[PDB]
Amino acid sequence: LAPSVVTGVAQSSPLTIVTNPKEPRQPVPASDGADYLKTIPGFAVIRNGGSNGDPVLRGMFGSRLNILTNGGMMLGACPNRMDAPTSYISPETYDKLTVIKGPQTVLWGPGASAGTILFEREPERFGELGSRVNASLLAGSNGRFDKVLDAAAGNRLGYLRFTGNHAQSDDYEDGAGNTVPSRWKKWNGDVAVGWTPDEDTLIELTAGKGDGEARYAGRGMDGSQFKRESLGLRFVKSNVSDVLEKVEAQVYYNYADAIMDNFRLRTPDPSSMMPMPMASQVDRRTLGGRLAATWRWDDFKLVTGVDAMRNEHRARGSKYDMMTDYYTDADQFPWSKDAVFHNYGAFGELTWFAAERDRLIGGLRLDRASVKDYRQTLKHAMANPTANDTRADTLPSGFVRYEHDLADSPTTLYAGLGHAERFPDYWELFSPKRGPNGSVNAFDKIKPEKTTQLDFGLQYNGDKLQAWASGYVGVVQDFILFSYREGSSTQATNVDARIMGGELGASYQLTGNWKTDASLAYAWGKNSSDDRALPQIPPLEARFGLTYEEGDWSAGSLWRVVAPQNRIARDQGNVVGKDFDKSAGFGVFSLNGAYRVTRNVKLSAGVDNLFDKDYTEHLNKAGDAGFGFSANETVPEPGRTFWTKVDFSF
Ligand SMILES: [Ag+]
Ligand SMILES: [Ag+]
């Protein structure tokens, strides 16, 4: 048995990682999706403040990543991406996290250039009439407090389950004793009812909200409200035919409604572009489906389905004026629509179990995408040449992967070619203020980026030693890249890019009591078009861990070691961030213990950043002038932080 703290997650299958978000993690997460991914090699995070980060996988940011909650997409609605998809996910509420690296599946939606990420809950198994609870409390160094409850009752015909959480922390501060603006607070509550006529069938209905706020150190506005809210329906039938093994059907709805201002969690900077009190409200309405059979016969297994998704965006803003200090809030004016996306697709994956030690797997996807611009005007107002204009395109995507187990050792090998085309997301067509040269606006001329990438690596699942390693090389056509000029404007452009990199990790049981493990993660990119390096690539990262287990208790030690990043393109990046200066390298150290008091109650505790290191991570965003930041100094990471946690389960 013997508990412990999660310092890093290894690659289990080829290209794939799974982990239980419900165990405690050593640099302890700001109960946000991004942070729960820091503990997986190859993920870096852009820091905005105390929480609500924007995750980066293998140097690839944003819509290059598929973040699926229970099966559905959940898109936020800041034009500057304050609410990333992950911003709405308290992972402790979910039951199983899973990541598939590269363009090596087509089951879970379109344009997964960089990888898919699947937050899930297993449906209850009951039988007798009964119940189960499990909960956790966390108390941490900066006013940090976290309640999480998950419970369910049911019998062998149906179940009911509620899950929720409440989390907050005050403004943390760093290694120089600077309070950094970074307060946050989050809660979520979701219910699920499920019907199991017999063990062959299952229908489940689900619903919930959350809210949250967050001061944003590197931004002119803060987030007063991130109202999330979701409906969901899913059907599952097993063993219909003898060649037909299961059929999955799924509908989902996800509403986001965010308010941002410069007066509800700060005051307006008098020397700023917004000395006025401003607020702006935005929302995103997302609707979607998925329907998919999985056939198994002879030596094969084929899953085939379709999916569609519509999503719509609206915004509205406040108004403060000349002679009087009368401020009309953005709830007084009507919503304005600016953008609708639809997407239908069809997909199939065939895997052949050749022999005992060989797996060949192919998959293809055909997607139709389309987008209508509803901005009659542009922000005090200009005319939008693209009003009510539509675009569309058809994007095929697919892959192949060969996997081979070895003669006389517990080794697998695998190589994969993947093609993935991908339509521009809301922030590629609307958030840029300029398009490519000679274009009217980014909406009209921004091409779908198409990446082609090779993936290889290996598993070693021995006894004392467990190692893994995966690499990649690829080229990206029409990569979409923001470029910055001095207000301060952006320009989106298509450019061509080479990318390579990889990650590896090992884990060695020394004695029955002493375990250790390490991990390295590298990424590297090039703008083949201007002959520059690609911007916003995380530098080389290395994590070392020692661990001692002895009956019911566990002691832990962790070194994170980060190289400098010297390949940077200045005044270029994505929608949220640009590059400017080269990263300094650093090292942070941490300890942890955990102790199992009884079956039902375990305790954990950790110090993060023992030696109170002043540092910032390269991708972190530039702090706000009015908040006491110099020109281009980036948001710093926390200093010494203590935390302790208790998990119950009955
Ligand atoms: Ag915003
Ligand atoms: Ag503003």
Numbering used by the authors: 66 to 444, 450 to 556, 560 to 723
Q: What does the paper behind this entry write?
A:
Here, we show that Pseudomonas aeruginosa OprC is an outer membrane, TonB-dependent transporter that is conserved in many Proteobacteria and which mediates acquisition of both reduced and oxidised ionic copper via an unprecedented CxxxM-HxM metal binding site. As indicated by the successful structure solution, OprC contains a single bound copper and shows the typical fold of a TBDT, with a large 22-stranded β-barrel occluded by an N-terminal approximately 15 kDa plug domain that, like in other TBDTs, completely occludes the lumen of the barrel. The copper binding site comprises residues Cys143 and Met147 in the plug domain and His323 and Met325 in the barrel wall. The CxxxM-HxM configuration, which coordinates the copper in a tetrahedral manner, is highly unusual and has, to our knowledge, not been observed before in copper homeostasis proteins.
While OprCWT and most single alanine mutants can be (partly) loaded via Cu(II) incubation, this is not the case for the C143A mutant. We hypothesised that removal of the cysteine could lead to much lower affinity for Cu(II), so that after SEC, nothing remains bound. To provide support for this, we determined the crystal structures of the OprC C143A mutant cocrystallised with Cu(II) or silver Ag(I). For each crystal, datasets were collected at 8,800 eV and 9,175 eV to distinguish between both metals. Bound copper is expected to give a strong anomalous peak only at 9,175 eV (which is above the copper K edge at 8,979 eV), while bound silver will give comparable peaks at both energies (the silver L-III edge is at 3,351 eV). For C143A cocrystallised with Cu(II), no anomalous peaks are visible at both energies, showing that Cu(II) binding is indeed abolished. Crucially, in the presence of silver, the same 3 anomalous peaks are visible as for WT OprC (compare Fig 3A and 3D), strongly suggesting that the C143A mutant can still bind Cu(I). All 4 residues in the OprC binding site contribute to copper binding, but not to the same extent and, in some cases, not equally for both copper redox states. This is illustrated by Cys143, which is essential for high-affinity Cu(II) binding but dispensable for Cu(I).
